[PDB]
Amino acid sequence: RFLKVKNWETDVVLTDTLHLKSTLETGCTEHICMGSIMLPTKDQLFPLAKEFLDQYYSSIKRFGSKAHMDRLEEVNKEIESTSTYQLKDTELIYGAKHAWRNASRCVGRIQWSKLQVFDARDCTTAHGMFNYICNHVKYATNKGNLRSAITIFPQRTDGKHDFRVWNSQLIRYAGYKQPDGSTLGDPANVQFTEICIQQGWKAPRGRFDVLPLLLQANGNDPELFQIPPELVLEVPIRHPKFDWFKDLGLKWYGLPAVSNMLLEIGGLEFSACPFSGWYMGTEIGVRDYCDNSRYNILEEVAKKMDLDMRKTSSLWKDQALVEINIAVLYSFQSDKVTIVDHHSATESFIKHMENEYRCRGGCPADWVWIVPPMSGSITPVFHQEMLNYRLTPSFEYQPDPWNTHVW
Amino acid sequence: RFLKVKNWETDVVLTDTLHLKSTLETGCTEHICMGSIMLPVRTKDQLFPLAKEFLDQYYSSIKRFGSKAHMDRLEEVNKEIESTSTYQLKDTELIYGAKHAWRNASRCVGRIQWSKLQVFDARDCTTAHGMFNYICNHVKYATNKGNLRSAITIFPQRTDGKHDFRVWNSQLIRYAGYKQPDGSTLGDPANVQFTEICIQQGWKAPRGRFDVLPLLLQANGNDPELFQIPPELVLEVPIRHPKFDWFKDLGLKWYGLPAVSNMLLEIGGLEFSACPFSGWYMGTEIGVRDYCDNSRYNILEEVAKKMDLDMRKTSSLWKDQALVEINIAVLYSFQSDKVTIVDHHSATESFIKHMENEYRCRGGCPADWVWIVPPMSGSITPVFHQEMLNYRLTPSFEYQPDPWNTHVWKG
Numbered sequence: 001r002f003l004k005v006k007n008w009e010t011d012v013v014l015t016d017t018l019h020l021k022s023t024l025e026t027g028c029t030e031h032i033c034m035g036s037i038m039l040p041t042k043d044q045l046f047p048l049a050k051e052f053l054d055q056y057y058s059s060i061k062r063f064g065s066k067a068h069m070d071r072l073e074e075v076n077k078e079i080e081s082t083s084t085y086q087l088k089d090t091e092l093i094y095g096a097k098h099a100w101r102n103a104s105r106c107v108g109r110i111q112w113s114k115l116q117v118f119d120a121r122d123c124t125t126a127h128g129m130f131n132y133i134c135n136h137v138k139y140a141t142n143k144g145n146l147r148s149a150i151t152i153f154p155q156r157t158d159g160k161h162d163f164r165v166w167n168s169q170l171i172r173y174a175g176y177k178q179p180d181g182s183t184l185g186d187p188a189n190v191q192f193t194e195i196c197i198q199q200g201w202k203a204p205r206g207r208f209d210v211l212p213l214l215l216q217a218n219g220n221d222p223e224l225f226q227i228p229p230e231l232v233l234e235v236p237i238r239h240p241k242f243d244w245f246k247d248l249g250l251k252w253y254g255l256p257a258v259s260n261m262l263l264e265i266g267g268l269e270f271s272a273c274p275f276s277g278w279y280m281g282t283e284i285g286v287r288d289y290c291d292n293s294r295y296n297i298l299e300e301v302a303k304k305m306d307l308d309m310r311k312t313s314s315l316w317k318d319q320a321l322v323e324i325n326i327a328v329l330y331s332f333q334s335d336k337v338t339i340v341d342h343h344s345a346t347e348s349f350i351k352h353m354e355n356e357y358r359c360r361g362g363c364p365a366d367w368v369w370i371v372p373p374m375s376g377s378i379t380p381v382f383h384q385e386m387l388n389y390r391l392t393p394s395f396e397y398q399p400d401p402w403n404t405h406v407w
Numbered sequence: 408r409f410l411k412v413k414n415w416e417t418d419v420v421l422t423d424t425l426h427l428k429s430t431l432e433t434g435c436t437e438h439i440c441m442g443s444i445m446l447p448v449r450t451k452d453q454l455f456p457l458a459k460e461f462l463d464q465y466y467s468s469i470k471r472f473g474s475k476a477h478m479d480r481l482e483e484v485n486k487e488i489e490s491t492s493t494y495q496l497k498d499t500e501l502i503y504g505a506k507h508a509w510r511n512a513s514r515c516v517g518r519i520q521w522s523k524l525q526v527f528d529a530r531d532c533t534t535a536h537g538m539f540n541y542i543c544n545h546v547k548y549a550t551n552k553g554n555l556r557s558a559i560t561i562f563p564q565r566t567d568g569k570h571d572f573r574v575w576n577s578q579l580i581r582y583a584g585y586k587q588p589d590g591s592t593l594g595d596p597a598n599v600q601f602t603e604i605c606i607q608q609g610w611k612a613p614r615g616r617f618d619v620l621p622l623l624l625q626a627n628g629n630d631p632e633l634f635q636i637p638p639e640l641v642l643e644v645p646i647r648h649p650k651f652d653w654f655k656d657l658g659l660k661w662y663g664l665p666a667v668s669n670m671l672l673e674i675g676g677l678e679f680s681a682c683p684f685s686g687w688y689m690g691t692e693i694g695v696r697d698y699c700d701n702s703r704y705n706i707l708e709e710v711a712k713k714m715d716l717d718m719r720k721t722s723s724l725w726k727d728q729a730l731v732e733i734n735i736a737v738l739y740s741f742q743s744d745k746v747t748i749v750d751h752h753s754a755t756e757s758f759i760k761h762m763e764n765e766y767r768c769r770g771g772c773p774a775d776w777v778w779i780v781p782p783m784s785g786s787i788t789p790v791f792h793q794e795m796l797n798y799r800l801t802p803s804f805e806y807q808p809d810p811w812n813t814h815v816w817k818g
């Protein structure tokens with residue numbers, strides 16, 4: 001019932017009871033652990049709304065008050081009638097902040113309560129979505145002093161009137177398959193880069209071409225939009241020691257903004273809720289730049305460094321990996337663009353876990369995602385036991401629209 | 408029920424059916440995942456069924472399931488059990504059992520080598536001196552002058568739980584750790600408690616930074632006894648860096664033979680409480696964990712200073728930088744001295760091939776992602792991108808309480 005998690009580097013032991021309020025399943029069973037798998041009605045709705053309202057009023061110290069009972073009734077009535085409901089702005093903001101608070105795969109949750117929520121529920125068209133998204137981008141970028149934000153479009157109704165941002169992130173680079181069979185630009189976005197063209201986009205066919213937004217409002221077909229360049233902060237990548245580094249022709253965008261997730265609050269589903277915070281260095285330097293299936297630039301960098309690439313045991317890949325990541329962080333800091341290294345971010349998360357354990361009785365955390373893709377054990381989270389479980393409100397994965405849209 | 412795991416780097420999908428044979432519990436529930444939790448006498452009543460499941464697996468493995476030899480064996484054991492409340496494995500069953508416990512060890516990335524395990528049968532051992540002798544032969548055989556050979560030595564199984572054989576050391580070879588009165592620690596901090604028990608038992612500590620600990624051996628539930636492994640039998644490797652001539656001056660060295668000796672081997676219900684085994688090191692075990700964990704030798708800073716790295720702010724990634732060099736040094740020193748070792752890139756690539764083979768020939772491969780992925784450069788190794796299924800199959804290697812916490816001293 002009362003589970004304990006131990007940190008093997010500091011012997012600190014925390015007790016978790018928050019998991020007892022868990023509602024969704026994990027993918028695992030007592031016979032099998034799937035911890036490393038990437039993707040494990042009015043009658044249905046009211047109980048959800050109730051659970052949410054109870055936690056909402058409880059958080060404001062008005063659990064079971066008249067206001068609570070009242071709102072509970074009002075929502076109850078609304079559901080019975082309309083077969084759904086609308087959150088009060090206060091609930092919208094609380095729900096979003098908590099969905100972030102509950103994202104077990106996010107190492108940056110110590111920032112959870114500072115989220116700026118943009119209510120775009122009155123939106124009706126793709127141009128309207130583009131407008132809201134541009135405002136989000138400018139607000140969050142804040143000339144390099146990034147501020148976390150989320151813009152929430154209209155909730156789901158009949159499932160045939162869904163708003164969806166087709167991009168996986170608001171800002172990403174295009175990827176095109178060349179005759180060579182090789183891939184130019186970002187390989188992860190090869191397909192999307194195609195669906196944009198299958199729509200009319202005029203690809204400059206470059207290595208770092210900011211993709212166009214493909215916005216879907218109310219179910220209708222999506223529409224393309226070029227984000228005003230001055231709104232897309234980019235960072236030229238240079239090494240604080242290797243002048244030749246810049247010759248690599250590397251740069252990345254400063255704003256990470258997940259746009260393909262679904263937000264669940266009190267049973268209500270928000271299929272278009274792009275959100276953004278700021279990068280942890282390794283996301284770019286380790287994953288985007290060195291993944292074998294991404295920009296895969298390890299060899300090139302190792303060559304320039306003139307390292308013995310004959311035997312894996314010389315650890316040239318490891319050597320290069322480090323330099324590359326030193327560069328990413330150096331560049332961002334130099335341009336005064338917010339960014340955080342894995343040491344600092346993970347140190348933050350441990351503090352955050354401790355705060356959540358004392359103030360909330362726990363903190364759902366997914367070790368597989370929390371530990372950085374490089375230098376795992378020299379970061380504190382590696383030695384930290386974590387309990388993973390699903391709490392709502394939450395952020396969930398959802399099918400790429402191009403695999404569900406009825407044109 | 409079928410289950411698939413996908414490798415997101417190659418899109419190779421695999422199907423697991425072997426998990427269906429999984430009987431033991433994982434620690435997780437439908438509502439919670441304990442995937443990152445370090446540590447999540449039998450009755451006749453429960454024994455024979457465990458015996459049967461095992462003998463069935465064994466006879467199927469040799470293509471004799473349902474034969475007369477199979478049936479007679481099941482009858483022979485059934486009888487022995489009701490007759491003696493236990494039973495003895497045939498040599499062939501023991502060898503098979505030991506190999507499969509390794510094969511089934513979900514946290515082991517070196518399982519591609521599982522079928523080559525050399526098994527030493529020490530079930531006739533009765534005293535600690537006998538244990539010492541067996542352990543010495545295992546170490547010399549396994550070490551093989553630097554060309555390491557995997558091996559396991561199996562002492563008598565548990566009976567009533569009051570006559571257990573145990574190796575109190577956590578590994579056959581490990582360095583002493585000494586807590587100084589000023590609060591600092593000399594040697595390996597991980598071994599401070601065990602070292603104190605050794606000194607108390609009478610060991611004369613040389614008190615250096617790399618003193619090979621003595622063996623503290625327990626036979627038939629008796630009080631443990633001390634023994635010094637012959638120095639000529641302990642292969643050690645001085646660590647130096649191929650480019651940094653000052654590295655050698657850090658005075659670092661490590662032993663070549665990694666030999667877990669505190670685990671419990673379960674086979675067909677029988678419990679082997681003393682079953683030391685060895686293979687060879689993956690570089691990062693020493694370079695990352697032994698040398699760089701904050702709670703171990705913790706040398707990042709000193710190596711950082713010597714390299715003249717900007718240590719003012721973490722974002723310089725000075726720790727990351729020093730880490731790589733230290734690991735380059737460990738691999739380099741071992742290769743130079745021709746002492747077997749494997750780097751994490753090579754070891755992980757091998758585990759992926761092994762894993763694919765296991766799915767195709769066995770229907771699955773239980774694997775613990777948290778442990779399989781190396782403690783450094785995680786995503787640039789293929790296992791990072793590989794989905795895995797973790798489940799417990801027997802035969803198996805299990806954790807057991809440290810003996811100093813359960814032993815009834817006879818004095």
Ligand code: HEM
Pocket residue numbers: 099100103105106107108109111115148149150275276277278279280283340345369395
């Ligand atoms: C302010 C700084 C923030 C930092 C440093 C941070 C860092 C991270 C990192 C490293 C990951 C894993 C990324 C990957 O490997 O692809 C992640 C995942 C995630 N974060 Fe955060 N995050 C921040 C803000 C946010 C915000 C504002 C939200 C939403 C309100 C959020 C929600 C999540 C979710 C749901 C995931 C997992 C997404 C998935 O499964 O792909 N994060 N975060």
Ligand code: HEM
Pocket residue numbers: 509512514515516517518520524557558559684685686687688689692749754778804
């Ligand atoms: C042939 C060389 C081998 C290599 C390269 C290898 C490598 C490893 C590594 C890197 C780990 C994790 C160690 C740690 O992080 O502390 C491990 C764990 C494990 N290995 Fe292997 N291994 C090998 C041979 C063996 C042998 C011979 C056995 C048994 C017969 C075995 C049984 C296990 C077990 C049971 C674990 C888990 C230990 C625990 O949970 O504490 N390994 N191995």
Ligand SMILES: N=C(NCCC[C@H](N)CN(O)CCN)N[N+](=O)[O-]
Pocket residue numbers: 256257258275276277278279280283
């Ligand atoms: N810092 C953040 N990172 C999440 C988005 C970027 C990620 N590298 C892409 N990604 O999840 C790739 C798909 N597996 N979030 N945020 O600050 O809002």
Ligand SMILES: N=C(NCCC[C@H](N)CN(O)CCN)N[N+](=O)[O-]
Pocket residue numbers: 665666667684685686687688689692
């Ligand atoms: N290569 C092997 N490694 C396992 C034993 C060494 C480990 N670093 C010590 N250890 O797990 C200390 C406590 N967590 N095995 N083997 O070759 O048989």
Ligand SMILES: C[C@H](O)[C@H](O)[C@H]1CNc2nc(N)[nH]c(=O)c2N1
Pocket residue numbers: 036037038368369370371415791792793794795
């Ligand atoms: C197969 C495995 O689940 C997959 O590679 C995971 C591992 N850990 C991760 N951790 C983070 N933060 N992000 C990822 O994309 C992944 N990928």
Ligand SMILES: C[C@H](O)[C@H](O)[C@H]1CNc2nc(N)[nH]c(=O)c2N1
Pocket residue numbers: 008382383384385386442443444445777778779
């Ligand atoms: C808390 C966490 O589970 C623990 O530190 C684990 C993580 N992964 C590991 N992986 C290996 N190979 N060895 C370890 O000791 C650990 N420690």
Ligand SMILES: [Zn+2]
Pocket residue numbers: 028029032033034035435439440441442
């Ligand atoms: Zn699990």
